[model samples]
Target: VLQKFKTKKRSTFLTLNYPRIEDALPTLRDVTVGCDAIEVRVDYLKDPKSSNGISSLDFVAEQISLLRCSTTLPIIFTIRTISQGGLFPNDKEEEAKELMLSAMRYGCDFVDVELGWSSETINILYQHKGYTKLIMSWHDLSGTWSWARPHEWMQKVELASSYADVIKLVGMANNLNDNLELEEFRTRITNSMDIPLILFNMGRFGQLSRILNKFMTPVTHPLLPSKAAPGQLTVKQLNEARVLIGEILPEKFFLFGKPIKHSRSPILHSTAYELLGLPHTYEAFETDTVDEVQKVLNLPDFGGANVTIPYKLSVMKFMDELSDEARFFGAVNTIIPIRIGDKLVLRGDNTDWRGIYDTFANALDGVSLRDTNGLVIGAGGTSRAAIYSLHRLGVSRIYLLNRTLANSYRVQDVFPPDYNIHIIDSDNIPSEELSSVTLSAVVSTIPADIELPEKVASVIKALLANKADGGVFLDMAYKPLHTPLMAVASDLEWKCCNGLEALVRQGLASFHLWTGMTAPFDAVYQKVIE
Candidate 1:
């Protein structure tokens, strides 16, 4: 299984950097879609109170942990100085060291260490770096260097080769030919040593360097108000270019399962694709014949497909690899083609967790869930996703009320026992252990698939009534927009999310997976329910 919360690709990555915390964290699911990893440039953040280079340094641990909860991408924490195109003021090398050392202490996958720093300060960083990879970097901010001065670029990168786990060098590009020169420079470095390089040229003329760089090529997004660096292309524009150049192809996508006629995926995906002007098509593929499903998937142009219902469990055998989420959930809701190296392998992922995560995100405002209690009904396929969602939302003590102990107990296999997942009975709801603390989020995954006995229903209604203060209720079924529990939640004035809402989120998430762009929610959503 892919390591916890990791994407398919290894060493090579496409980076979409985020400047602010709260601004990007809310839309974590949508924000992370287009890129392989997130680069947290602490120099650009203005979110946490008393925001500044050294002051914002304190935000490091919280920021990294929050990002970890939402994404599997390696967090690259960088704090650059003004000379390096960052906000840290001049003569604040000491403060810069403070911020850099703080992030290393707080923990990050990588930390950018500027070259030509005070040797003593740099030495302390080297000693305390621990497991975080050091990205030794140098930027030509004077705007004087170009492909004509390739030797200067080579000299700077060579200086860092000894100390750097990864070498990064950025310079200004004045013309299209600069792209050719930078690539050749990278080739020279790669041939010389085994070190990884993130060498690129900036400015409008340097767009190719941003796209073609193999290691952590920085990109932007449509939603960001400003670009972190000049000439950084949005992921949408990058993919658009990839598609036109035939690096990316338009192919078929589907939902593979039995009794999928009731699925609204076709409308959800097709409409969003139309808005994005993509040629990809998504349609339902109803099948009980296992051989036929594999045959269709093996088709040369078959991009990906969703495995729903009973097939979610059975479709696992054909997968070349499975994501940690799928491995944990013991199911594969989505099948995506991931290039592990040069080989194209079909990997399984569970966007159902993303669906449930998005469901709570819509109404998570003013809700307290950290170290708090949350409830999940049913121990079926959707139950794990529900529990995973709650766990990530800061709730460690999750209570489950399912039909069977055997099935419900299995969801625990995927998580550490310390998660404190308690299996409760309907009769146990009145007990203080279940009701004393707020059930800030209650998710019912079996509403549309199975009927709840009156006994279960009787317990759930009382649970909702106990949390009179208010919380969020999500029923992951689109057909029954107004299920029994949903009606009860409505009477209690709790925030509610219907199936259509989750369908939009899961569909949008999958769309982002297929094409590196987020669909316009307002437009794609209006058409979905209508």
Candidate 2:
């Protein structure tokens, strides 16, 4: 059994501290879905008065028998003493030993005995030792130890390793940085020890430590009702953590943009992760400056980032390399971290083109790319992606119009000499010049809430009025789902789409680049749309 435990996968252990056997029976079902092992905490049944009307070791034996029969997963019987942060009486050392031995006789796969117990009481375990393995644990309620003295922690781990089949080290975290320190300690100890080990921090911020425990010994609770320990995660949530954070590593990916509070990139990516079983996360960062973005990217576990809005162009300055697509468009929407030997190189790429081009391909009708003329609103980073996408589609001509005329020229300067990209000032549109050019598609890169300069709004209205035949209208804003431009396009009876399609398309492209896994497109699309 001990040798089997040594080679087990990093899996979740569901902790059952319920005082009543009836209460734990129903949860055994949820176990098969997310957990690989069961930990029956016998300490909760310690107090005679606290028992749910059932007391005595005979009743405990009966309950243990029922639990063993309930699931195929191996069971760990733990009769933790009060000195070790458990409810069992400290004076009943002899009685606790009897309960533990009884549990071993009742077919428990493992037994946990605190290191603080008297050696006389623990050595008695040698008499009954069989298929059941011993897990010697030490709980440090005094908070994390100073990093300068890791040898002090190592000594205790080594001592436990000498006596038990498996060793467990638990500590209380005083701060976030302490969590990082404990992680480092786990890595160091696991690499050095020959035996299987479990290490985690306890307290309010202990979730990270437990989720990333390499030995797969972190205790989890059911989805509802009471929890067995402070900072313990539910089995389902722990499964999610396993997919989004990994078994023993910290991997971080983020979405960088201002006004990012409403973004669904996190939901989109996490849904994709859950479907593909990938253990990496996508978070949203409200950063308006390059320095803020730089600070996040420099973190030790920085994986990648999705840049949006105003900072897309600015973020390029910090990049070590740029993909051809990003360089050609003069903007970057994705930041991928590549490792060369010991160095982490940050590579920039643009996926907004996929979003824009794919959205147009799906929405347009009665117009072929080579025969179509296009109008792009706004001249920011997104506008650059839209222009490049149109060029790839072989659109006959593109009208670059923006509130700031020079910005439109900036977009136009990037195109070839033969490309008919006309720069138009939003306030002074040459209406007659565009009258003969029936616009086949209009892609707006700005948000809907911005009151389009009255002149720009009028020019857009005039351009669409000449479209005797309705065309496709796409607004690259998704928070509201329906943008102002789409509303007007619908009024004109043009085939129109909001930004959600583009958002998901670009997100999937970026997803593949980061994880090298195909995005579960249907699930991700449904998640963001919902």
Candidate 3:
């Protein structure tokens, strides 16, 4: 497990040591933003008999159950026994053993057991542990394992190494050089041992060990009133120290467009990066010109970017490579920076079509899109993406409507003849051929914030009304969630998918292209809607 962190792809994960599990549900999700897994200090919990006369195991399990719902991060079940410095006094060993066993049965990611326990007890815990990793820990809070005799103190952990999946060797550092000694010991352990070690020297002066160790390091947060261990660094301090040491380098990402102050992509990406401990920040960069977009993207630290309106299609000329989908749609919504022969090359990809396709797919709720007709409003880049999406959806006939017939023809020319594309006259009424058209799926790429021309609105409403059998309507304009078109569709009993959903769906695909990690869909969606 320790060797796993040695990879370039993985970073030093911060295990947030949340001491109180009893009342941690509310603040749990918020405080755990930056940290990776959570260390549920079972010792800090109320005794079974004390908590409304419930059994101790039941009481502890109740907290674990609540915690399970509160956060998705892995839980490390640890009960710091009284001898090693638990707050609860005069611990009953058998009862504690049951508690530890309960944690394993309940599917905790890791269980920390003291090495000082009997060999039989250690083996018992080890044997009973299901899939949970056993962290055999030895805490010398009194500083016995200081710089003076590093090897001698290290030998004590060798016995634990036999039973431990992960060995936690922590102690107080008496002097500044003690951190150096601890680091030296870590070098020996990493090279000589197969198991991962969470080794750190504890104290205000000994934070070097906490900051330097690349494996999982337990940490605290400012919101919590207590610390699980003395000389522990907060998550913020730990992250800053990590960045200084070059253990973590922050990547700058942004949503680039002419106007996006009202965009919620920053929050969506921020919440995801924080949850995954990516050491990256996503911000909004509302820029005007192509030259301005080039300046920020050419920066050395530019991780990746999302290209939105006014530049989605125009920015393709600057990209070193364009994905087939982007090339097919003639638009790029995502830019992934790749290093090729000491040069950074921007790769353009499109997820706008995916957003449109997926949002319409979900709204249909298992209704067949094949053989059904799809209507696309507006004939720009999004309209192109929509045509591609409709073709992908197996919609054989696609009707295109835009105020300008020239713009509609340009969009229509981008697709192959097999797509069976038809450009509707914006000024035309509900003509016989148009009135007879039945569309099961419709995508509107029209501007969301402005009032559509009465003629264009009538054309759209007429097409939507033709899908009298309750089809799906997707409006890509998300400035105000509920647009006038949404009301019209809802009135017609059509399943309406708003533009924010389209924004998030495309953002999810773009995030995957940039990081190769799946962004939390539910979390991102919930945040955008809020």
lDDT: which candidate is best? Answer: 3
TM value for model 2: 0.47
Evaluation by lDDT, superior candidate among 1 and 2: 2
lDDT of 3 by residue, 278-311 (tens): 6888889987686688888888889899988888
Best of the two (2, 3) by lDDT: 3
Error of 3 at 343 (Å): 9.2
Best by TM-score: 1
Task: Indicate the worst ten consecutive residues by lDDT in candidate 2.
Answer: 46-55
Off by over 4 Å in 3: 1-22, 51-55, 88-91, 244-299, 309-477, 482-530
- Model 2 ranges off by over 4 Å: 1-250, 256-262, 285-302, 308-318, 364-368, 402-407, 424-433, 450-458, 465-470, 520-522
Tens digits of per-residue lDDT, candidate 1, 333-445, equal 88987665657788888887888887676566545577777889877777888888898888877888876667677877667878878887554444766456567788988
Which is the winner by TM-score between candidate 1 and candidate 3? 1
Estimate the TM-score of every prediction. Answer: 0.78, 0.47, 0.61
RMSD of 2: 18.0
Residue lDDT tens for model 2, 188-263? 7667767777778777787788877746555554443466667887645665676665443547889888889988
Which residue pairs clash within candidate 2? 243-279
TM-score winner between 1 and 2, please give it. Answer: 1
- lDDT for model 3, please: 0.76
Candidate 1: lDDT of 157?
A: 68
